[PDB]
Design an enzyme around this catalytic site. Structure first.
Site, mmCIF file in Angstrom:
data_model
loop_
_atom_site.group_PDB
_atom_site.id
_atom_site.type_symbol
_atom_site.label_atom_id
_atom_site.label_comp_id
_atom_site.label_asym_id
_atom_site.label_seq_id
_atom_site.Cartn_x
_atom_site.Cartn_y
_atom_site.Cartn_z
ATOM 1 N N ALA A 10 0.841 -1.198 0.000
ATOM 2 C CA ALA A 10 0.000 0.000 0.000
ATOM 3 C C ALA A 10 0.881 1.254 0.000
ATOM 4 O O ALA A 10 2.070 1.203 0.324
ATOM 5 C CB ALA A 10 -0.955 0.057 1.187
ATOM 6 N N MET A 12 1.488 5.140 1.416
ATOM 7 C CA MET A 12 1.344 6.010 2.586
ATOM 8 C C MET A 12 1.673 7.449 2.258
ATOM 9 O O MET A 12 2.758 7.788 1.769
ATOM 10 C CB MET A 12 2.265 5.482 3.697
ATOM 11 N N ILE A 14 3.136 10.949 2.684
ATOM 12 C CA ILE A 14 4.359 11.260 3.420
ATOM 13 C C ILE A 14 4.138 12.409 4.392
ATOM 14 O O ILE A 14 4.947 12.603 5.296
ATOM 15 C CB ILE A 14 5.521 11.556 2.446
ATOM 16 N N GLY A 16 1.326 13.765 7.162
ATOM 17 C CA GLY A 16 0.096 13.519 7.907
ATOM 18 C C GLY A 16 -0.109 14.578 8.987
ATOM 19 O O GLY A 16 0.788 15.370 9.266
ATOM 20 N N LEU A 17 -1.298 14.653 9.567
ATOM 21 C CA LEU A 17 -1.594 15.529 10.674
ATOM 22 C C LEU A 17 -1.460 14.785 11.999
ATOM 23 O O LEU A 17 -2.024 13.697 12.169
ATOM 24 C CB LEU A 17 -3.006 16.096 10.552
ATOM 25 N N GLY A 18 -0.729 15.395 12.924
ATOM 26 C CA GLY A 18 -0.607 14.829 14.261
ATOM 27 C C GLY A 18 -1.756 15.309 15.139
ATOM 28 O O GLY A 18 -2.317 16.372 14.884
ATOM 29 N N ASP A 43 -2.602 10.941 12.103
ATOM 30 C CA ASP A 43 -1.922 10.087 13.082
ATOM 31 C C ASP A 43 -2.697 10.211 14.398
ATOM 32 O O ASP A 43 -2.858 11.328 14.892
ATOM 33 C CB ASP A 43 -0.469 10.421 13.237
ATOM 34 N N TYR A 48 -4.233 9.342 23.336
ATOM 35 C CA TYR A 48 -4.431 10.777 23.140
ATOM 36 C C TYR A 48 -5.823 11.231 23.579
ATOM 37 O O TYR A 48 -6.083 12.433 23.747
ATOM 38 C CB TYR A 48 -4.187 11.176 21.680
ATOM 39 N N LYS A 77 -2.289 3.411 17.228
ATOM 40 C CA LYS A 77 -1.332 2.747 18.061
ATOM 41 C C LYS A 77 -1.966 2.034 19.246
ATOM 42 O O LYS A 77 -2.861 2.560 19.905
ATOM 43 C CB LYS A 77 -0.338 3.802 18.571
ATOM 44 N N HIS A 110 2.673 1.143 20.188
ATOM 45 C CA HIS A 110 3.014 2.549 20.445
ATOM 46 C C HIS A 110 4.402 2.733 21.049
ATOM 47 O O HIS A 110 5.137 3.677 20.703
ATOM 48 C CB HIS A 110 1.934 3.143 21.344
HETATM 49 N N1 LIG Z 1 4.717 7.604 18.492
HETATM 50 C C1 LIG Z 1 4.770 8.313 19.603
HETATM 51 O O1 LIG Z 1 5.332 7.991 20.639
HETATM 52 C C2 LIG Z 1 4.589 9.812 19.368
HETATM 53 C C3 LIG Z 1 5.203 10.735 20.279
HETATM 54 C C4 LIG Z 1 5.050 12.115 20.069
HETATM 55 C C5 LIG Z 1 4.296 12.568 18.965
HETATM 56 N N2 LIG Z 1 3.703 11.604 18.104
HETATM 57 C C6 LIG Z 1 2.828 12.060 16.957
HETATM 58 O O2 LIG Z 1 3.548 13.054 16.187
HETATM 59 C C7 LIG Z 1 2.757 14.291 16.116
HETATM 60 C C8 LIG Z 1 3.631 15.538 16.023
HETATM 61 O O3 LIG Z 1 4.399 15.634 17.259
HETATM 62 P P1 LIG Z 1 4.107 16.635 18.433
HETATM 63 O O4 LIG Z 1 2.630 16.824 18.693
HETATM 64 O O5 LIG Z 1 4.879 16.064 19.594
HETATM 65 O O6 LIG Z 1 4.738 18.070 18.073
HETATM 66 P P2 LIG Z 1 5.101 18.923 16.768
HETATM 67 O O7 LIG Z 1 4.197 18.539 15.657
HETATM 68 O O8 LIG Z 1 6.553 18.873 16.623
HETATM 69 O O9 LIG Z 1 4.735 20.401 17.286
HETATM 70 C C9 LIG Z 1 3.352 20.675 17.552
HETATM 71 C C10 LIG Z 1 3.376 22.109 18.177
HETATM 72 O O10 LIG Z 1 3.770 22.982 17.077
HETATM 73 C C11 LIG Z 1 2.888 24.013 16.830
HETATM 74 N N3 LIG Z 1 2.835 24.319 15.437
HETATM 75 C C12 LIG Z 1 2.337 23.595 14.363
HETATM 76 N N4 LIG Z 1 2.537 24.146 13.204
HETATM 77 C C13 LIG Z 1 3.212 25.316 13.531
HETATM 78 C C14 LIG Z 1 3.680 26.298 12.650
HETATM 79 N N5 LIG Z 1 3.555 26.287 11.320
HETATM 80 N N6 LIG Z 1 4.327 27.372 13.249
HETATM 81 C C15 LIG Z 1 4.497 27.457 14.621
HETATM 82 N N7 LIG Z 1 4.037 26.480 15.473
HETATM 83 C C16 LIG Z 1 3.391 25.410 14.882
HETATM 84 C C17 LIG Z 1 1.566 23.481 17.369
HETATM 85 O O11 LIG Z 1 0.758 24.622 17.751
HETATM 86 P P3 LIG Z 1 -0.865 24.641 17.535
HETATM 87 O O12 LIG Z 1 -1.388 23.249 17.624
HETATM 88 O O13 LIG Z 1 -1.282 25.600 18.647
HETATM 89 O O14 LIG Z 1 -1.006 25.267 16.113
HETATM 90 C C18 LIG Z 1 1.975 22.645 18.619
HETATM 91 O O15 LIG Z 1 2.174 23.482 19.756
HETATM 92 C C19 LIG Z 1 1.888 14.180 17.425
HETATM 93 O O16 LIG Z 1 0.855 15.101 17.529
HETATM 94 C C20 LIG Z 1 1.516 12.696 17.363
HETATM 95 O O17 LIG Z 1 0.559 12.546 16.305
HETATM 96 C C21 LIG Z 1 3.830 10.229 18.273
HETATM 97 O O1 LIG Z 2 3.438 8.549 23.372
HETATM 98 C C1 LIG Z 2 3.022 9.577 22.737
HETATM 99 O O2 LIG Z 2 2.723 9.434 21.533
HETATM 100 C C2 LIG Z 2 3.408 10.908 23.279
HETATM 101 C C3 LIG Z 2 3.612 10.719 24.791
HETATM 102 N N1 LIG Z 2 4.843 10.640 25.140
HETATM 103 N N2 LIG Z 2 5.077 10.614 26.500
HETATM 104 C C4 LIG Z 2 6.504 10.528 26.845
HETATM 105 C C5 LIG Z 2 6.635 8.931 26.928
HETATM 106 N N3 LIG Z 2 7.781 8.314 27.031
HETATM 107 C C6 LIG Z 2 7.684 6.918 27.090
HETATM 108 C C7 LIG Z 2 8.722 5.982 27.200
HETATM 109 C C8 LIG Z 2 8.379 4.640 27.241
HETATM 110 C C9 LIG Z 2 9.471 3.615 27.354
HETATM 111 F F1 LIG Z 2 9.396 2.840 26.210
HETATM 112 F F2 LIG Z 2 10.663 4.147 27.082
HETATM 113 F F3 LIG Z 2 9.501 2.786 28.314
HETATM 114 C C10 LIG Z 2 7.088 4.151 27.176
HETATM 115 C C11 LIG Z 2 6.046 5.039 27.069
HETATM 116 C C12 LIG Z 2 6.392 6.398 27.031
HETATM 117 S S1 LIG Z 2 5.320 7.712 26.898
HETATM 118 C C13 LIG Z 2 4.109 10.672 27.476
HETATM 119 O O3 LIG Z 2 4.349 10.634 28.661
HETATM 120 C C14 LIG Z 2 2.756 10.745 27.021
HETATM 121 C C15 LIG Z 2 1.744 10.794 27.986
HETATM 122 C C16 LIG Z 2 0.427 10.872 27.537
HETATM 123 C C17 LIG Z 2 0.125 10.906 26.168
HETATM 124 C C18 LIG Z 2 1.121 10.858 25.224
HETATM 125 C C19 LIG Z 2 2.475 10.774 25.664
#
Ligand SMILES: NC(=O)c1ccc[n+]([C@@H]2O[C@H](COP(=O)([O-])OP(=O)(O)OC[C@H]3O[C@@H](n4cnc5c(N)ncnc54)[C@H](OP(=O)(O)O)[C@@H]3O)[C@@H](O)[C@H]2O)c1
Ligand SMILES: O=C(O)Cc1nn(Cc2nc3cc(C(F)(F)F)ccc3s2)c(=O)c2ccccc12
Length: 315
Positions: A10, A12, A14, A16-18, A43, A48, A77, A110
């Site tokens: 599939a 994807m 490149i 997406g909205l967080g 995403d 969340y 996730k 996750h």
């Molecule tokens: N897999 C995981 O463990 C994990 C962990 C962290 C994040 N994620 C995912 O990745 C996504 C992105 O990461 P993130 O939420 O940590 O942070 P980010 O996208 O790096 O930054 C979001 C911050 O940036 C601001 N922003 C967005 N566009 C902007 C622009 N053009 N100019 C100035 N500021 C701007 C937003 O403000 P406003 O919203 O006020 O506009 C918000 O405060 C998450 O939302 C989530 O979907 C996954």
């Molecule tokens: O997760 C989101 O997407 C954002 C995210 N990140 N973190 C920092 C984290 N650090 C970790 C480290 C481990 C570890 F694997 F390292 F043990 C396991 C789990 C986590 S959560 C948070 O604490 C968190 C809390 C609520 C909702 C979202 C998040």
């Protein structure tokens, strides 16, 4: 090009909205606007606590015939307290029902770490340590494979897995589906060359999270670096007649990564998608890469003793 081919055959998008931290009363609007403006990848995650409201937006735009479901790429996730084999399908179904979907395009473990099941997302012991679960990543992966075989998800992946934990899955006995994606933190202060090369060498697509440095992260500290305000990054932006965010989004796209900037601000949601009309030069790319500081937004230190904590290892 707008999409990347996954190893499940599939495509994807490149960009997406967080949605992490997107408030439940603003995220429906934010996702509608994003779809209107071109985004086809959202995403999500159960943890969340806003999947319901995200779903409302998806549903309305499908209803309105702004988009068709096949054109969308919706990602969620499995949270840490659901790694037990008996808990994964229902975790997935809760997400599907909240998002009002009958399938996910991608479902990720996750974090590699399993936590003790219960109501609590971060169950703690009387020393505030997170309580582990006795599950291991391999059996969890086998449960994610069943979701593919039951039609609930079109692809499965991992997030916050280090190269050794990726390798454990690729080498898992009786592996049936390889991970399609590893979603990790990645930005000019955490450039990830090593983990990214590993993954891409295996045909695993990397998604970059926190590409702007998560300025709204709840634990931000004064002396923390700030990408958005980095004069050196601002100068590259200026040189290109773009905003700093635009440069920070375009940067992982040119590394063959997927990137998911978060915003609830409609002007920013729009701005953030307008990154397909300019190019960073190789020098720019290497210059941005040179800002690496191994600085993490997401490395919750009360998990440091988990056996599967992913960040002790170099990469
Ligand atoms: N897999 C995981 O463990 C994990 C962990 C962290 C994040 N994620 C995912 O990745 C996504 C992105 O990461 P993130 O939420 O940590 O942070 P980010 O996208 O790096 O930054 C979001 C911050 O940036 C601001 N922003 C967005 N566009 C902007 C622009 N053009 N100019 C100035 N500021 C701007 C937003 O403000 P406003 O919203 O006020 O506009 C918000 O405060 C998450 O939302 C989530 O979907 C996954
Ligand atoms: O997760 C989101 O997407 C954002 C995210 N990140 N973190 C920092 C984290 N650090 C970790 C480290 C481990 C570890 F694997 F390292 F043990 C396991 C789990 C986590 S959560 C948070 O604490 C968190 C809390 C609520 C909702 C979202 C998040």
């Amino acid at each position: 090009a707008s999409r990347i081919l996954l190893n499940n055959g599939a495509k994807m998008p490149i960009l997406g909205l967080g949605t992490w931290k997107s408030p439940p009363g603003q995220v429906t609007e934010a996702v509608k606007v994003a779809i209107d403006v071109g985004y086809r990848h959202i995403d999500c995650a159960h943890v969340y606590q806003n999947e319901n409201e995200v779903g409302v937006a998806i549903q309305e735009k499908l209803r309105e015939q702004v988009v068709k479901r096949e054109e969308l790429f919706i990602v969620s996730k499995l949270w840490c307290t659901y790694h037990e084999k008996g808990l994964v399908k229902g975790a997935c179904q809760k997400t599907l029902s909240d998002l009002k979907l009958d399938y996910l395009d991608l479902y990720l473990i996750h974090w590699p770490t399993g936590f003790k099941p219960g109501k609590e997302f971060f169950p703690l012991d009387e020393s505030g340590n997170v309580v582990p679960s006795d599950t291991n990543i391999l059996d969890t992966w086998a449960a994610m494979e069943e979701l593919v075989d039951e039609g609930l998800v079109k692809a499965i992946g991992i997030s916050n897995f280090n190269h050794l934990q990726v390798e454990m899955i690729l080498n898992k006995p009786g592996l049936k589906y390889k991970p399609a994606v590893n979603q990790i933190e990645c930005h000019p202060y955490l450039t990830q060359e090593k983990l990214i090369q590993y993954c891409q060498s295996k045909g695993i697509v990397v998604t970059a999270y926190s590409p702007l440095g998560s300025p709204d992260r709840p634990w931000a500290k004064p002396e923390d670096p700030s990408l958005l305000e980095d004069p050196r990054i601002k100068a590259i932006a200026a040189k290109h007649n773009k905003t700093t965010a635009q440069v920070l989004i375009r940067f992982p796209m040119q590394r063959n990564l997927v990137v998911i900037p978060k915003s609830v601000t409609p002007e920013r949601i729009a701005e953030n998608f307008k990154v397909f009309d300019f190019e960073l030069s190789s020098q720019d790319m290497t210059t941005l890469l040179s800002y690496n500081r191994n600085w993490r937004v997401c490395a919750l230190l009360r998990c440091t003793s988990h056996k599967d904590y992913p960040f002790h290892e170099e990469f």
